Amino acid sequence: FEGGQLPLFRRLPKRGFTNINRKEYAIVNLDQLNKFEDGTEVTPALLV
Amino acid sequence: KKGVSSTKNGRDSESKRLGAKRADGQFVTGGSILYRQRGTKIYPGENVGRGGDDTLFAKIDGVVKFERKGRDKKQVSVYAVA
Amino acid sequence: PKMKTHRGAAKRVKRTASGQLKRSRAFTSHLFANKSTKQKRQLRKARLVSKSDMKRVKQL
RNA sequence: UCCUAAGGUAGCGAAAUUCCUUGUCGGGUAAGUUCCGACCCGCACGAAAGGCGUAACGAUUUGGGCACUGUCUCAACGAGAGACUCGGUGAAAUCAUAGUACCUGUGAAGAUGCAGGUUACCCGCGACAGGACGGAAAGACCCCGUGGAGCUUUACUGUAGCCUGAUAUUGAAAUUCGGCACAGCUAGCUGUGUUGGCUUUCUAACCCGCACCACUUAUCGUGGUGGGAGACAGUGUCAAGCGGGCAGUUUGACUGGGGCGGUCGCCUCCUAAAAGGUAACGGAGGCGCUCAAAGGUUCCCUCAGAAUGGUUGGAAAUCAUUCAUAGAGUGUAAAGGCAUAAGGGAGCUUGACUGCGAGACCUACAAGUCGAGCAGGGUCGAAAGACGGACUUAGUGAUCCGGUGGUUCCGCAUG
RNA sequence: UAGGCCCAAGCGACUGUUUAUCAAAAACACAGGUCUCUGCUAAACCGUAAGGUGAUGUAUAGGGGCUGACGCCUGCCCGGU
RNA sequence: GACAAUGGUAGGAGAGCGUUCUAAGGGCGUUGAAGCAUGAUCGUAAGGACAUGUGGAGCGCUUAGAAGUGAGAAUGCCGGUGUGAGUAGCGAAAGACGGGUGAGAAUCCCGUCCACCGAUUGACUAAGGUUUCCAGAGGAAGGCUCGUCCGCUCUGGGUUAGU
RNA sequence: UAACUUGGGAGUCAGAACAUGGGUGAUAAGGUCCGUGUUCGAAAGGGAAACAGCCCAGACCACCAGCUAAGGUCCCAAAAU
RNA sequence: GAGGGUAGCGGAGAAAUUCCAAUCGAACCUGGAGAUAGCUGGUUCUCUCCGAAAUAGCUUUAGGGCUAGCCUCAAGUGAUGA
RNA sequence: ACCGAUAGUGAACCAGUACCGUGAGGGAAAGGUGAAAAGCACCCCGGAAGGGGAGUGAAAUAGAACCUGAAACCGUGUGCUUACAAGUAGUCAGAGCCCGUUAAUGGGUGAUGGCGUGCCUUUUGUAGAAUGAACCGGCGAGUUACGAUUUGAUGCAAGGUUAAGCAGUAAAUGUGGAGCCGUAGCGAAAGCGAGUCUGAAUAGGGCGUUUAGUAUUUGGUCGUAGACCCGAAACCAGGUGAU
RNA sequence: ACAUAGCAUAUCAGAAGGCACACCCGGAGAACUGAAACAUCUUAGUACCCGGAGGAAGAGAAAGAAAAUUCGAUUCCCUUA
Ligand SMILES: [Mg+2]
Ligand SMILES: [Mg+2]
Ligand SMILES: [Mg+2]
Ligand SMILES: [Mg+2]
Ligand SMILES: [Mg+2]
Ligand SMILES: [Mg+2]
Ligand SMILES: [Mg+2]
Ligand SMILES: [Mg+2]
Ligand SMILES: [Mg+2]
Ligand SMILES: [Mg+2]
Ligand SMILES: [Mg+2]
Ligand SMILES: [Mg+2]
Ligand SMILES: [Mg+2]
Ligand SMILES: [Mg+2]
Ligand SMILES: [Mg+2]
Ligand SMILES: [Mg+2]
Ligand SMILES: [Mg+2]
Ligand SMILES: [Mg+2]
Ligand SMILES: [Mg+2]
Ligand SMILES: [Mg+2]
Ligand SMILES: [Mg+2]
Ligand SMILES: [Mg+2]
Ligand SMILES: [Mg+2]
Ligand SMILES: [Mg+2]
Ligand SMILES: [Mg+2]
Ligand SMILES: [Mg+2]
Ligand SMILES: [Mg+2]
Ligand SMILES: [Mg+2]
Ligand SMILES: [Mg+2]
Ligand SMILES: [Mg+2]
Ligand SMILES: [Mg+2]
Ligand SMILES: [Mg+2]
Ligand SMILES: [Mg+2]
Ligand SMILES: [Mg+2]
Ligand SMILES: [Mg+2]
Ligand SMILES: [Mg+2]
Ligand SMILES: [Mg+2]
Ligand SMILES: [Mg+2]
Ligand SMILES: [Mg+2]
Ligand SMILES: [Mg+2]
Ligand SMILES: [Mg+2]
Ligand SMILES: [Mg+2]
Ligand SMILES: [Mg+2]
Ligand SMILES: [Mg+2]
Ligand SMILES: [Mg+2]
Ligand SMILES: [Mg+2]
Ligand SMILES: [Mg+2]
Ligand SMILES: [Mg+2]
Ligand SMILES: [Mg+2]
Ligand SMILES: [Mg+2]
Ligand SMILES: [Mg+2]
Ligand SMILES: [Mg+2]
């Protein structure tokens, strides 16, 4: 509150809107796979 | 306890910063501002180009020198060599 | 009671360390110089984040 | 002669109103700023916010006499209550500690405390009032607070009430005056159907603080009977205008204290002390735009004046000749610049472009200007190059919200 | 123990009432004057309504302004609200 | 052994004593605990001890926790005691003497004399107040003095209605 | 012997007198307003008779030790009649 | 003199801002309620180290605030400071 | 790890009582003999109250105002000192006379000289004639919960971590992996990815990449709550009052 | 006039009032304050007032949530945040 002078968040303008469906993929990098073996599968039941 | 007269003017302009902004000898870079004026008090020389009636600014790298070449005129050059 | 952010932070995006405003003086007059209309990109906020870093805390 | 809706009549008038003012003149006293009578030169009397006069009346206001007196020049003495002395009983406001002198001076600018002098042995009772900025009330005067109250108004926004329409309760009948849908004829009329209104006319709703009868012996009330009004009112619902009657509220700051006058942002000098910066109610001026060419390019030319003569004569509206360094000109106010022109003409044209930008200067921030070079498309030029507005510095206004033109973007099961 | 008196002005006519506890007056009332509203469930108020005042009254009577006995008198303007 | 540094407000940064309670360990206490008073002692400060009196029953010391934790000012709050001070004031006014009571008398009781209101300081009724009414007894406190006395204390009593 | 970058914690936005360059005022102020230095504020001592702002100089504590600064040397009062 | 009525946005007023339980430009008593206060006063034990400002910009702002400036611990960079 | 009589409820005590108000409503003070009443038989002065002996009791210096008894303050004889003196009351020198210690470069008194204007708040500045305090006791002002960010600590390591509940000396330990944060960002978004975004561009830019985060807690500070205490006129509800 | 209001007897115990009004459910409902002023907003549907019950009242047996594969009355606790 700058004392009557309007604050910093009145001069700057607003822009954007978020979404209603902003599907957030759990971003697993490729480096993390260098720990296991047999090469069978990677799986949303196993990679958890 | 008598009503004194009204003043008339007050009313100054703000300011502008003028004069030299770099000095003779040091090492400048190809966008920097050498000197600036509301007119032409210092002409440009080699490797220094004018702006819009102001802001003599160095084209390329080097060190600066002040110099006269007439009886009154003065100019600024930059030599990249070292 | 939990710290209540105030929603003037629809106007700033946390970059990874610093804020990010959107540059002011957008609409309502363009009788204004042409290379200055070209300045329409955004800058990070200055070091007056001292005066506001208890207001925008949960945008993270 | 000019203007207004008209321009103050009667009667009073230096008055409870007369600033200049103790207006000038006459009574009263030897002496008269107040009083009494008249004058008009009414700053700024005046006809029901009343004018002018009036016998009686007032604890009224003002001036002048008589009777009378310690009110006074000028005080004196008597009587009583307290004060005073002794026996009885015995509070209060106040209070940093105190064995507490005066002068001149210094000091937060008026000293019991400090420097320098001077004068005073310790202790109490009776008085007086110059100090102790003595006590008594967190000064009422003044000024501040984005402090409250009460009052006012053609401040803003509202509201109790009051007036007028629509539609419900709410029914029948007629007269008309319409627009609209069709026919037929001479833009206009007949029938012809929707279809609003407009006047009336009834009668079952409703109302009658409207008389009679019963509950009952009772002015309320309920019920019937007869009357009068009548589809109006009264009532709800929605809509306009009225509305200080009543409520919450706002009414800026700067200021050699405050209201009054003037100011409030940008641009240019000076003050400003040879970098930049640098105030005051210090001194001087401007702006809230203008220009399709007064912008870009390629060429070429040099001025206002001073002389000297020459149809017209401005002293000076054209013409030549000569000496002219800028003494002219630059759309605009000033400073800094310009004769390589950045001034003046002549030919073409739109770079008064799109996407940008290394790096600087200024700066609390938001802003603010200057940018070499990079790509796409050009204009001018033979080419080298120049051009991303006018010789610079003024000519403008965050956000929010809304409008219009695009949009490869989201569009709450899917489209 | 029981009234000082007279002459002469200004504002009020008078008797009366008022700021308990600093103001008794030239203020307020008053009889009279006048304008305007009100036809009877009157307007005007109090109440949200029912009820009541007005009034068990009926324009020679009610509520509301402005002046303040009596005397002589109340001149001009309807542009504006 | 050197070598330098050490005035200080607003304010920033460290190291510290003491008070109350709990946990654990370890003690002192009728051969006298905590507080209270007095003393020439010890630590750089806040503070720590030790003898001697008074006191009659519950305290320290080390470690570590948790906080209602420290007093000189708020015209602070409450309770005490002073200064002013033996100072102002005793709340209108005519009393004097004799006798008696009494441990004590200008003040209480009896007498004479004197003065004071007398359209009232007189005699009655309602309004209020609620034992103040009367007798006997008492003297701490109340009465602006005194007291043997009282409208105050103690004990025991007192108000009668057909009109 | 400092400087700068980052991150926690503030306090100040009522200054004053001297010495000089200036505006305002009247070449008036212990006036007001800027520049620039010092000291006080936040600094005790010694001198200026006493005296926040002038002149010397910066107090960690002890001692009955010596030199010196500003001002002084007949007496009050240390030191040259 | 005795009974009675009118109650706070209200009542009464021969109008003065007078009266309404020693008062009143809107009574008192509770409760919202520890209202708010940019304003005064007050804030308690000790010692070491370092130690400022009274300015700039903008404000219904001038005795208030926010940022920069000036101090302080903690890390770094480390020759940039005089 | 709540108070121990100015605390704790206002109220330990024949408390919503005395007491103030017409009323609605305000609203106090005041605990302690000893183990047991053994509560002072008797003698004496005095009218009594009180008092000195005797007596009970470990103690009456424990006498029903009763344990302990501090300060202000009012008093009693005393060792030194004061009637020619100018004073924020001291301090530093130092004579004389009196007393002998937690035995140490000893304690009290002070004829006379230097030196010197109390304290706190507030200030450009104060002895200030600016404010505040009569004095002595007692009480009386940065606290807590929930969060956010920071350094200091301690577990684990590309991983860290439990909430509610359910069992259990109101045991702080067992289970519970719903969730949160972090390992990857960029853009308004679709979407893209070690890089995207604007953009015609592989040009130039802004923000990233190369790895340390996490859970609890001791500090410093913010936010919401009354949030360092004490103070206003004033507003709005609901009532009691015309004596 | 037919009956109804009305009127007269006999039975019945249904109600009224009070409550700790702590907690709950409906009716009606302010302002101080924050925004650095203030009117929309917020203090808050909070305090006061009134009505009705209970040992607990209200809600409640889908005209629901959801979008995948669906599971399923209401209430309450933790996260979503
Ligand atoms: Mg005369
Ligand atoms: Mg005359
Ligand atoms: Mg007339
Ligand atoms: Mg008239
Ligand atoms: Mg009279
Ligand atoms: Mg006397
Ligand atoms: Mg006497
Ligand atoms: Mg002087
Ligand atoms: Mg003097
Ligand atoms: Mg005397
Ligand atoms: Mg006297
Ligand atoms: Mg005052
Ligand atoms: Mg009828
Ligand atoms: Mg109003
Ligand atoms: Mg002002
Ligand atoms: Mg002035
Ligand atoms: Mg300069
Ligand atoms: Mg869809
Ligand atoms: Mg849909
Ligand atoms: Mg009269
Ligand atoms: Mg009149
Ligand atoms: Mg008249
Ligand atoms: Mg007309
Ligand atoms: Mg220090
Ligand atoms: Mg600290
Ligand atoms: Mg103890
Ligand atoms: Mg005290
Ligand atoms: Mg006092
Ligand atoms: Mg006397
Ligand atoms: Mg006798
Ligand atoms: Mg009686
Ligand atoms: Mg007596
Ligand atoms: Mg008796
Ligand atoms: Mg001067
Ligand atoms: Mg200066
Ligand atoms: Mg200094
Ligand atoms: Mg001296
Ligand atoms: Mg001397
Ligand atoms: Mg008045
Ligand atoms: Mg009256
Ligand atoms: Mg309060
Ligand atoms: Mg509140
Ligand atoms: Mg230092
Ligand atoms: Mg005690
Ligand atoms: Mg009692
Ligand atoms: Mg014995
Ligand atoms: Mg004693
Ligand atoms: Mg003297
Ligand atoms: Mg200060
Ligand atoms: Mg004094
Ligand atoms: Mg005082
Ligand atoms: Mg009466």
mmCIF file of C-alpha atoms (C1' of nucleotides) in Angstrom, chain I:
data_model
loop_
_atom_site.group_PDB
_atom_site.id
_atom_site.type_symbol
_atom_site.label_atom_id
_atom_site.label_comp_id
_atom_site.label_asym_id
_atom_site.label_seq_id
_atom_site.Cartn_x
_atom_site.Cartn_y
_atom_site.Cartn_z
ATOM 1 C "C1'" A I 1 4.672 -27.740 35.216
ATOM 2 C "C1'" C I 2 -3.952 -24.079 37.499
ATOM 3 C "C1'" C I 3 -4.532 -19.705 41.658
ATOM 4 C "C1'" G I 4 -3.239 -19.678 47.330
ATOM 5 C "C1'" A I 5 -6.794 -14.168 49.905
ATOM 6 C "C1'" U I 6 -5.006 -6.880 45.819
ATOM 7 C "C1'" A I 7 -4.541 -13.903 42.981
ATOM 8 C "C1'" G I 8 -8.988 -17.613 42.431
ATOM 9 C "C1'" U I 9 -15.806 -16.912 40.604
ATOM 10 C "C1'" G I 10 -18.204 -10.539 42.077
ATOM 11 C "C1'" A I 11 -18.968 -13.804 46.164
ATOM 12 C "C1'" A I 12 -13.647 -19.106 51.051
ATOM 13 C "C1'" C I 13 -16.235 -14.789 55.790
ATOM 14 C "C1'" C I 14 -25.059 -16.265 57.688
ATOM 15 C "C1'" A I 15 -23.068 -12.165 48.682
ATOM 16 C "C1'" G I 16 -25.802 -10.403 44.600
ATOM 17 C "C1'" U I 17 -25.916 -9.407 51.131
ATOM 18 C "C1'" A I 18 -24.469 -4.225 53.472
ATOM 19 C "C1'" C I 19 -24.486 0.121 50.612
ATOM 20 C "C1'" C I 20 -25.972 4.132 46.343
ATOM 21 C "C1'" G I 21 -30.466 4.783 42.875
ATOM 22 C "C1'" U I 22 -37.661 6.749 42.516
ATOM 23 C "C1'" G I 23 -36.638 3.505 39.021
ATOM 24 C "C1'" A I 24 -34.175 -0.417 34.917
ATOM 25 C "C1'" G I 25 -29.666 -1.443 37.068
ATOM 26 C "C1'" G I 26 -25.046 -0.940 39.614
ATOM 27 C "C1'" G I 27 -22.103 -3.470 43.703
ATOM 28 C "C1'" A I 28 -17.801 -3.697 47.684
ATOM 29 C "C1'" A I 29 -14.555 -4.752 52.077
ATOM 30 C "C1'" A I 30 -13.778 -8.759 55.284
ATOM 31 C "C1'" G I 31 -9.328 -16.036 56.017
ATOM 32 C "C1'" G I 32 -5.030 -18.059 60.162
ATOM 33 C "C1'" U I 33 -4.679 -18.336 69.166
ATOM 34 C "C1'" G I 34 -2.804 -23.073 70.356
ATOM 35 C "C1'" A I 35 -1.467 -29.749 70.004
ATOM 36 C "C1'" A I 36 -5.790 -29.213 73.386
ATOM 37 C "C1'" A I 37 -9.759 -23.685 75.955
ATOM 38 C "C1'" A I 38 -5.793 -25.347 79.282
ATOM 39 C "C1'" G I 39 -9.591 -18.255 77.456
ATOM 40 C "C1'" C I 40 -5.329 -15.587 83.039
ATOM 41 C "C1'" A I 41 -8.226 -18.508 90.188
ATOM 42 C "C1'" C I 42 -6.547 -15.199 93.357
ATOM 43 C "C1'" C I 43 -3.411 -10.142 95.459
ATOM 44 C "C1'" C I 44 -2.971 -4.861 94.377
ATOM 45 C "C1'" C I 45 -4.105 1.113 91.993
ATOM 46 C "C1'" G I 46 -8.620 2.736 89.376
ATOM 47 C "C1'" G I 47 -15.855 4.220 89.110
ATOM 48 C "C1'" A I 48 -15.002 1.175 85.057
ATOM 49 C "C1'" A I 49 -11.738 0.506 80.701
ATOM 50 C "C1'" G I 50 -7.046 -0.896 81.215
ATOM 51 C "C1'" G I 51 -2.488 -2.412 84.176
ATOM 52 C "C1'" G I 52 1.606 -4.845 87.571
ATOM 53 C "C1'" G I 53 2.317 -9.544 90.044
ATOM 54 C "C1'" A I 54 0.735 -14.670 90.464
ATOM 55 C "C1'" G I 55 -1.133 -18.897 87.139
ATOM 56 C "C1'" U I 56 -1.993 -22.399 82.397
ATOM 57 C "C1'" G I 57 1.109 -23.502 78.324
ATOM 58 C "C1'" A I 58 7.273 -25.646 74.865
ATOM 59 C "C1'" A I 59 6.204 -20.533 73.774
ATOM 60 C "C1'" A I 60 1.636 -15.127 76.174
ATOM 61 C "C1'" U I 61 7.512 -10.663 73.652
ATOM 62 C "C1'" A I 62 0.527 -16.597 71.277
ATOM 63 C "C1'" G I 63 -3.790 -12.884 75.135
ATOM 64 C "C1'" A I 64 -9.326 -13.517 71.354
ATOM 65 C "C1'" A I 65 -7.838 -5.961 66.699
ATOM 66 C "C1'" C I 66 -4.327 -12.686 68.653
ATOM 67 C "C1'" C I 67 1.210 -16.871 63.884
ATOM 68 C "C1'" U I 68 5.290 -14.508 61.159
ATOM 69 C "C1'" G I 69 5.421 -8.169 61.653
ATOM 70 C "C1'" A I 70 9.067 -5.252 56.632
ATOM 71 C "C1'" A I 71 8.389 0.717 54.910
ATOM 72 C "C1'" A I 72 6.312 5.483 55.145
ATOM 73 C "C1'" C I 73 5.591 7.874 59.794
ATOM 74 C "C1'" C I 74 5.361 9.659 65.213
ATOM 75 C "C1'" G I 75 8.670 8.885 69.621
ATOM 76 C "C1'" U I 76 12.530 8.070 74.059
ATOM 77 C "C1'" G I 77 18.254 8.903 76.647
ATOM 78 C "C1'" U I 78 22.342 8.862 74.254
ATOM 79 C "C1'" G I 79 28.927 8.923 71.251
ATOM 80 C "C1'" C I 80 30.437 13.308 67.401
ATOM 81 C "C1'" U I 81 28.787 17.979 65.797
ATOM 82 C "C1'" U I 82 26.032 23.499 65.099
ATOM 83 C "C1'" A I 83 24.118 30.417 66.708
ATOM 84 C "C1'" C I 84 29.451 35.825 61.127
ATOM 85 C "C1'" A I 85 26.329 32.244 57.851
ATOM 86 C "C1'" A I 86 24.780 32.259 50.896
ATOM 87 C "C1'" G I 87 23.812 25.775 50.510
ATOM 88 C "C1'" U I 88 20.137 20.297 43.870
ATOM 89 C "C1'" A I 89 22.709 18.545 50.111
ATOM 90 C "C1'" G I 90 26.816 15.304 47.565
ATOM 91 C "C1'" U I 91 31.855 13.870 46.140
ATOM 92 C "C1'" C I 92 37.629 14.345 46.828
ATOM 93 C "C1'" A I 93 41.293 16.090 49.947
ATOM 94 C "C1'" G I 94 41.938 16.559 55.575
ATOM 95 C "C1'" A I 95 42.458 18.237 61.561
ATOM 96 C "C1'" G I 96 40.579 16.924 66.431
ATOM 97 C "C1'" C I 97 37.750 13.672 69.735
ATOM 98 C "C1'" C I 98 35.221 8.956 70.655
ATOM 99 C "C1'" C I 99 34.566 2.797 69.170
ATOM 100 C "C1'" G I 100 37.500 -1.883 67.945
ATOM 101 C "C1'" U I 101 35.998 -5.384 62.603
ATOM 102 C "C1'" U I 102 33.230 -11.428 57.942
ATOM 103 C "C1'" A I 103 40.797 -8.254 61.116
ATOM 104 C "C1'" A I 104 41.440 -5.021 56.388
ATOM 105 C "C1'" U I 105 45.525 -1.044 52.664
ATOM 106 C "C1'" G I 106 39.274 -0.662 59.765
ATOM 107 C "C1'" G I 107 33.894 1.645 61.306
ATOM 108 C "C1'" G I 108 31.048 6.442 62.877
ATOM 109 C "C1'" U I 109 31.236 11.721 63.428
ATOM 110 C "C1'" G I 110 33.543 16.441 60.178
ATOM 111 C "C1'" A I 111 36.306 22.594 62.012
ATOM 112 C "C1'" U I 112 38.156 24.087 56.451
ATOM 113 C "C1'" G I 113 39.256 23.978 51.203
ATOM 114 C "C1'" G I 114 38.628 22.670 45.662
ATOM 115 C "C1'" C I 115 34.641 20.693 42.165
ATOM 116 C "C1'" G I 116 28.703 21.370 41.048
ATOM 117 C "C1'" U I 117 21.924 23.822 38.235
ATOM 118 C "C1'" G I 118 17.777 16.748 40.669
ATOM 119 C "C1'" C I 119 15.119 12.477 37.590
ATOM 120 C "C1'" C I 120 11.641 10.767 33.152
ATOM 121 C "C1'" U I 121 8.834 11.982 28.868
ATOM 122 C "C1'" U I 122 9.596 15.408 24.891
ATOM 123 C "C1'" U I 123 12.497 17.924 21.808
ATOM 124 C "C1'" U I 124 16.561 21.911 16.629
ATOM 125 C "C1'" G I 125 17.403 22.447 21.737
ATOM 126 C "C1'" U I 126 15.787 21.877 29.018
ATOM 127 C "C1'" A I 127 18.419 23.396 35.699
ATOM 128 C "C1'" G I 128 14.378 25.059 33.107
ATOM 129 C "C1'" A I 129 9.487 29.423 34.810
ATOM 130 C "C1'" A I 130 7.313 22.743 29.528
ATOM 131 C "C1'" U I 131 4.722 17.936 31.339
ATOM 132 C "C1'" G I 132 4.417 14.034 35.073
ATOM 133 C "C1'" A I 133 5.327 12.120 40.567
ATOM 134 C "C1'" A I 134 3.212 13.853 48.396
ATOM 135 C "C1'" C I 135 5.913 9.466 50.442
ATOM 136 C "C1'" C I 136 6.213 3.651 51.371
ATOM 137 C "C1'" G I 137 4.344 -1.039 50.160
ATOM 138 C "C1'" G I 138 1.364 -4.480 46.651
ATOM 139 C "C1'" C I 139 -0.937 -5.070 41.532
ATOM 140 C "C1'" G I 140 -0.043 -3.369 36.418
ATOM 141 C "C1'" A I 141 2.015 -3.561 29.304
ATOM 142 C "C1'" G I 142 4.911 -7.891 22.329
ATOM 143 C "C1'" U I 143 1.109 -13.223 24.467
ATOM 144 C "C1'" U I 144 -1.390 -17.709 21.991
ATOM 145 C "C1'" A I 145 -3.597 -20.677 18.060
ATOM 146 C "C1'" C I 146 -3.316 -21.165 12.783
ATOM 147 C "C1'" G I 147 -0.487 -20.289 8.511
ATOM 148 C "C1'" A I 148 3.725 -17.903 4.777
ATOM 149 C "C1'" U I 149 9.036 -16.913 4.183
ATOM 150 C "C1'" U I 150 13.866 -16.965 6.199
ATOM 151 C "C1'" U I 151 18.710 -18.428 8.509
ATOM 152 C "C1'" G I 152 20.584 -22.255 13.058
ATOM 153 C "C1'" A I 153 19.688 -27.752 14.212
ATOM 154 C "C1'" U I 154 18.638 -33.048 13.108
ATOM 155 C "C1'" G I 155 16.890 -37.680 10.205
ATOM 156 C "C1'" C I 156 16.800 -39.637 4.700
ATOM 157 C "C1'" A I 157 18.772 -38.894 -0.247
ATOM 158 C "C1'" A I 158 16.386 -38.513 -6.300
ATOM 159 C "C1'" G I 159 13.937 -39.156 -3.041
ATOM 160 C "C1'" G I 160 11.417 -37.058 1.598
ATOM 161 C "C1'" U I 161 6.347 -37.207 4.108
ATOM 162 C "C1'" U I 162 1.616 -38.316 6.824
ATOM 163 C "C1'" A I 163 -3.867 -36.147 7.699
ATOM 164 C "C1'" A I 164 -8.802 -37.872 9.888
ATOM 165 C "C1'" G I 165 -9.789 -42.688 12.045
ATOM 166 C "C1'" C I 166 -8.791 -47.438 14.657
ATOM 167 C "C1'" A I 167 -6.101 -50.006 18.950
ATOM 168 C "C1'" G I 168 -3.272 -48.071 23.433
ATOM 169 C "C1'" U I 169 -0.557 -46.189 31.608
ATOM 170 C "C1'" A I 170 -6.249 -38.549 28.507
ATOM 171 C "C1'" A I 171 0.601 -43.310 27.349
ATOM 172 C "C1'" A I 172 3.252 -40.256 21.457
ATOM 173 C "C1'" U I 173 3.944 -45.763 18.932
ATOM 174 C "C1'" G I 174 1.527 -49.244 15.682
ATOM 175 C "C1'" U I 175 -1.119 -49.095 11.300
ATOM 176 C "C1'" G I 176 -3.485 -45.996 7.620
ATOM 177 C "C1'" G I 177 0.019 -43.811 0.770
ATOM 178 C "C1'" A I 178 -6.434 -40.434 0.172
ATOM 179 C "C1'" G I 179 -3.098 -36.180 -0.441
ATOM 180 C "C1'" C I 180 1.174 -32.218 -0.465
ATOM 181 C "C1'" C I 181 6.094 -30.834 -2.150
ATOM 182 C "C1'" G I 182 10.270 -32.193 -5.380
ATOM 183 C "C1'" U I 183 12.700 -34.897 -9.898
ATOM 184 C "C1'" A I 184 11.321 -30.002 -16.480
ATOM 185 C "C1'" G I 185 10.219 -25.864 -18.354
ATOM 186 C "C1'" C I 186 7.967 -22.693 -21.874
ATOM 187 C "C1'" G I 187 3.124 -20.078 -23.726
ATOM 188 C "C1'" A I 188 -3.155 -16.669 -22.544
ATOM 189 C "C1'" A I 189 -4.410 -21.508 -24.727
ATOM 190 C "C1'" A I 190 -4.446 -25.759 -27.978
ATOM 191 C "C1'" G I 191 0.198 -28.187 -27.615
ATOM 192 C "C1'" C I 192 5.013 -28.840 -27.643
ATOM 193 C "C1'" G I 193 9.611 -30.716 -24.752
ATOM 194 C "C1'" A I 194 15.703 -30.077 -22.997
ATOM 195 C "C1'" G I 195 14.379 -26.670 -24.823
ATOM 196 C "C1'" U I 196 9.842 -23.825 -26.121
ATOM 197 C "C1'" C I 197 7.390 -18.441 -27.273
ATOM 198 C "C1'" U I 198 6.646 -14.271 -30.459
ATOM 199 C "C1'" G I 199 7.769 -14.813 -35.510
ATOM 200 C "C1'" A I 200 7.933 -15.496 -42.770
ATOM 201 C "C1'" A I 201 12.435 -17.195 -40.623
ATOM 202 C "C1'" U I 202 17.389 -22.896 -38.520
ATOM 203 C "C1'" A I 203 17.951 -14.707 -37.841
ATOM 204 C "C1'" G I 204 18.012 -12.033 -33.057
ATOM 205 C "C1'" G I 205 15.859 -11.941 -28.447
ATOM 206 C "C1'" G I 206 12.915 -13.135 -22.955
ATOM 207 C "C1'" C I 207 12.358 -17.350 -19.565
ATOM 208 C "C1'" G I 208 14.593 -22.337 -18.732
ATOM 209 C "C1'" U I 209 18.573 -26.822 -19.059
ATOM 210 C "C1'" U I 210 23.786 -28.693 -16.271
ATOM 211 C "C1'" U I 211 20.565 -30.617 -10.257
ATOM 212 C "C1'" A I 212 18.714 -30.901 -4.042
ATOM 213 C "C1'" G I 213 14.821 -31.148 -2.458
ATOM 214 C "C1'" U I 214 12.048 -32.655 1.750
ATOM 215 C "C1'" A I 215 9.679 -33.548 7.301
ATOM 216 C "C1'" U I 216 9.760 -31.612 12.404
ATOM 217 C "C1'" U I 217 11.502 -28.013 15.616
ATOM 218 C "C1'" U I 218 14.582 -23.485 18.585
ATOM 219 C "C1'" G I 219 14.968 -18.265 17.124
ATOM 220 C "C1'" G I 220 13.827 -12.831 13.822
ATOM 221 C "C1'" U I 221 9.567 -10.787 11.128
ATOM 222 C "C1'" C I 222 4.701 -10.663 8.516
ATOM 223 C "C1'" G I 223 -1.381 -12.066 8.037
ATOM 224 C "C1'" U I 224 -6.066 -13.101 10.082
ATOM 225 C "C1'" A I 225 -8.075 -12.757 15.059
ATOM 226 C "C1'" G I 226 -9.034 -7.146 20.419
ATOM 227 C "C1'" A I 227 -3.086 -8.819 18.815
ATOM 228 C "C1'" C I 228 1.972 -3.939 23.280
ATOM 229 C "C1'" C I 229 -1.457 -1.382 27.304
ATOM 230 C "C1'" C I 230 -4.545 2.628 29.072
ATOM 231 C "C1'" G I 231 -8.202 6.935 27.065
ATOM 232 C "C1'" A I 232 -12.527 9.647 23.740
ATOM 233 C "C1'" A I 233 -16.814 12.631 22.202
ATOM 234 C "C1'" A I 234 -20.346 9.494 19.006
ATOM 235 C "C1'" C I 235 -23.721 5.474 16.406
ATOM 236 C "C1'" C I 236 -27.686 1.206 16.401
ATOM 237 C "C1'" A I 237 -30.827 -2.331 18.922
ATOM 238 C "C1'" G I 238 -33.963 -3.805 23.689
ATOM 239 C "C1'" G I 239 -36.192 -1.578 28.037
ATOM 240 C "C1'" U I 240 -36.998 1.580 32.928
ATOM 241 C "C1'" G I 241 -38.696 6.770 34.238
ATOM 242 C "C1'" A I 242 -43.970 12.894 34.201
ATOM 243 C "C1'" U I 243 -42.950 11.753 42.512
#
